[PDB]
Amino acid sequence: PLCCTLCHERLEDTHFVQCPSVPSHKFCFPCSRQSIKQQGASGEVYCPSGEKCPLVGSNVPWAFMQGEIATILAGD
């Protein structure tokens, strides 16, 4: 089933974050909000799995764009 990697909640009928390089890394907005809060205290916000997963095609961790952060932190 399509479920959040961190809290295991089913993702149907909700928005979620999809890691570009690891299809199974999917995160609900509540978990993504917590990850942004925790990570952004110290810099860029990488994959909420903690694994610093790369961009597809480049050897560098992907990170949330400012617009993605703003979308997620606005609330439901």
């Binding site: 928005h15 979620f16 974050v17 999809q18 890691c19 597809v56 617009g67 993605e68 979308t71 997620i72």
Partner: peptide, 6 residues
């Protein structure tokens, strides 16, 4: 890249 938000 495309947005990560689905």
């Amino acid at each position: 890249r495309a947005s990560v938000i689905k």
